[PDB]
Subunit: 94 residues, 3 copies
Amino acid sequence: KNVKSKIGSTENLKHQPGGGKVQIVYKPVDLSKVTSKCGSLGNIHHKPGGGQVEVKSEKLDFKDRVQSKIGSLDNITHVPGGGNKKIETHKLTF
Amino acid sequence: KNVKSKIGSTENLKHQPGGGKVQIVYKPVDLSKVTSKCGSLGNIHHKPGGGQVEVKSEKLDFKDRVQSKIGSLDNITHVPGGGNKKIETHKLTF
Amino acid sequence: KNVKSKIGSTENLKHQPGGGKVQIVYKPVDLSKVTSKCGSLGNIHHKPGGGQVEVKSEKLDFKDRVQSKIGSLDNITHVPGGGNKKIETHKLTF
């Protein structure tokens, strides 16, 4: 049970600005089997080449301007609680 | 049970600006089997070449301007709670 | 049960601006089997070439301007809660 509220707020939220989220799972399985029964065999050169995984962010020029003008917040009643009674907010001028 | 509210707010939300979300799963399976029974065999050169996975973000020029003007927020009653009674907000001028 | 509300708000939401979402699943299966029974065989050159997967974002010039003018938010009653009673919001001038 989440209650979230924003009244006249400025937010500049940034999750992982440059690189971001990089998830690399390098899990090859190698079960290359050689069976020789009642015979003859030469040399075994087993040279399986490794993978190359590269993730690059070269030149990034990010510019963000965030402006907020509120004249006045004045007269706010904000009740996110429960079972509350008799909540009053008065404002008079002159 | 989520209750979200935004009254006169400015937001500049950015999730993974540069790189983003990169998920690489490099999991090849190699079961190349050689069976020799009651015979003869020469050399075995086993050279399976690795994969190449590259993800690149070269030159990125991102510019964001966010402006917000509110004259006045004034007279707000905001009740996201439950079972509340008798909530009043008065504003008079002159 | 989600309740979302936006009254006079400015939002500049961006999910993965540059790279985006890149999902590469490199999982080849290699079951090339050689069986020799009661015979003769020469050399075995097993050279399966690896794949090349490349994802590129070269030159990206993104520019976003977001302007918002609200004169006044004034007199708002916002009740997303349940079972609430007697919620009043008064505004008088002169």
